[PDB]
Enzyme design. Structure first.
Site, PDB file in Angstrom:
ATOM      1  N   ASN A 106      41.970  76.637  98.467  1.00 61.60           N
ATOM      2  CA  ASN A 106      41.144  75.372  97.664  1.00 61.60           C
ATOM      3  C   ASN A 106      41.801  73.957  96.948  1.00 61.60           C
ATOM      4  O   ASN A 106      41.952  74.102  95.517  1.00 61.60           O
ATOM      5  CB  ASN A 106      39.663  75.896  98.420  1.00 61.60           C
ATOM      6  N   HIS A 123      47.388  73.743  95.485  1.00 63.07           N
ATOM      7  CA  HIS A 123      47.195  72.519  97.110  1.00 63.07           C
ATOM      8  C   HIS A 123      47.357  71.720  96.522  1.00 63.07           C
ATOM      9  O   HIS A 123      46.931  70.275  97.414  1.00 63.07           O
ATOM     10  CB  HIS A 123      46.672  72.682  98.280  1.00 63.07           C
ATOM     11  N   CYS A 172      47.750  52.285  92.055  1.00 62.43           N
ATOM     12  CA  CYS A 172      48.199  52.869  90.602  1.00 62.43           C
ATOM     13  C   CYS A 172      48.573  52.294  89.409  1.00 62.43           C
ATOM     14  O   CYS A 172      48.370  50.901  89.470  1.00 62.43           O
ATOM     15  CB  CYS A 172      49.957  53.794  90.962  1.00 62.43           C
ATOM     16  N   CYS A 177      53.272  49.013  87.422  1.00 63.55           N
ATOM     17  CA  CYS A 177      53.669  50.065  88.651  1.00 63.55           C
ATOM     18  C   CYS A 177      53.053  48.889  89.739  1.00 63.55           C
ATOM     19  O   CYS A 177      53.266  48.729  90.921  1.00 63.55           O
ATOM     20  CB  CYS A 177      52.738  51.664  88.969  1.00 63.55           C
ATOM     21  N   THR A 215      41.411  84.196 103.438  1.00 60.10           N
ATOM     22  CA  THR A 215      42.499  83.821 103.939  1.00 60.10           C
ATOM     23  C   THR A 215      43.044  83.998 104.290  1.00 60.10           C
ATOM     24  O   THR A 215      42.594  84.926 105.471  1.00 60.10           O
ATOM     25  CB  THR A 215      43.484  83.933 102.212  1.00 60.10           C
ATOM     26  N   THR A 241      36.307  87.668 107.147  1.00 54.98           N
ATOM     27  CA  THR A 241      35.712  87.961 107.589  1.00 54.98           C
ATOM     28  C   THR A 241      36.112  88.425 109.618  1.00 54.98           C
ATOM     29  O   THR A 241      35.363  88.880 110.446  1.00 54.98           O
ATOM     30  CB  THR A 241      35.203  86.047 108.527  1.00 54.98           C
ATOM     31  N   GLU A 242      37.170  88.265 109.461  1.00 54.90           N
ATOM     32  CA  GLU A 242      38.349  89.016 110.100  1.00 54.90           C
ATOM     33  C   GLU A 242      39.608  89.490 109.585  1.00 54.90           C
ATOM     34  O   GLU A 242      39.972  89.021 108.885  1.00 54.90           O
ATOM     35  CB  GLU A 242      38.470  87.715 111.381  1.00 54.90           C
TER      36      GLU A 242
HETATM   37 CL   LIG Z   1      42.942  80.192 104.010  1.00 59.10          CL
HETATM   38 ZN   LIG Z   2      52.017  53.887  90.424  1.00 61.69          ZN
END
Ligand SMILES: [Cl-]
Ligand SMILES: [Zn+2]
EC number: 2.3.1.-
Lengths: 267, 4
Positions: A106, A123, A172, A177, A215, A241-242
């Protein structure tokens, strides 16, 4: 798999190093929109359409509107009973010299908001940016992340694209940059951070109990973490849930919302 | 590994 809560609790009482893998089910239970399989939709797309390098390369303004909307809704969202059970477990077991670590797919930071300290966000995060030019990663909680997105990102279908020129998108601030920023979120088809995966592997290698909570177990490589753990004989318990394609590979499966099963499980 |  087994559905004896009493049997799982016997393993839980003895476990010294618990890994908890959490996915989109846990965020959905807080009412966070996951934009995967109802879901629901952002105006006409789902996450599979917009969380991709292609979508960002074609229309970075549209991708930013989507992520701006997701950042903004988080103000109205709170950790649910599952997040709280998981955080309290970590604190209680830590006082006993026992380790609990959360490996989450998440990106909404609700685990942190609930107080989880041992956390691997594999992630990325809606509240981090990465520069498409220099690669620097930075935390960012500002509402709105840039003036041009103010009031934008509306989710209703038919909403016109903001069509913000790339120079007015988040930029940025590293001296010299000023490259375009992207959300520091792993997109479909991108590799996960090798340093993060090294941390994941250390936790998986040393844990003696593994929980897979909320998941779908069809997003890789995350779908494969729990299978490698059971190989050493470590019990894996799935809370969803499943059933999933990985369900028959686990020691336990407890069906239902995570905010319903986890408080009992981790009590 | 790549995110699927
Ligand atoms: Cl997931
Ligand atoms: Zn940058």
């Amino acid at each position: 798999p087994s559905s004896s809560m009493a049997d799982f609790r016997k393993f839980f009482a003895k476990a010294k190093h618990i890994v908890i893998i959490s996915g989109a089910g846990v965020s959905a239970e807080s009412g966070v929109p996951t934009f995967r399989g109802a879901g629901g939709y952002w105006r006409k797309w789902q996450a599979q359409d917009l969380a991709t390098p292609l979508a960002f390369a074609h229309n970075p303004s549209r991708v930013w509107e989507f992520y701006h909307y997701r950042r903004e809704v988080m103000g109205s969202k709170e950790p649910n009973a599952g997040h709280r059970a998981i955080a309290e477990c970590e604190t209680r077991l830590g006082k006993q010299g026992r380790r609990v670590v959360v490996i989450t797919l998440n990106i909404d930071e609700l685990h942190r908001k609930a107080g989880t300290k041992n956390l691997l966000e594999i992630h990325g995060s809606l509240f981090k940016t990465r520069c498409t030019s220099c690669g620097v990663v930075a935390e960012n909680y500002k509402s709105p992340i840039c003036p041009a997105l103010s009031g934008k990102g509306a989710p209703e279908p038919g909403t016109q694209d903001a069509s913000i020129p790339v120079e007015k998108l988040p930029r940025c601030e590293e001296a010299g940059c000023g490259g375009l920023l992207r959300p520091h979120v792993v997109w479909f088809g991108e590799n996960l951070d090798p340093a993060i995966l090294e941390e994941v592997d250390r936790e998986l290698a040393h844990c003696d109990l593994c929980l897979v909570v909320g998941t779908s177990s069809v997003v890789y490589p995350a779908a494969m973490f729990a299978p490698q753990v059971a190989a050493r004989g470590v019990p894996v318990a799935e809370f969803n849930t499943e059933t999933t394609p990985a369900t028959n590979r686990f020691r336990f499966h407890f069906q239902g919302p995570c905010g319903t099963t986890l408080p009992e499980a981790l009590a | 590994f790549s995110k699927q």
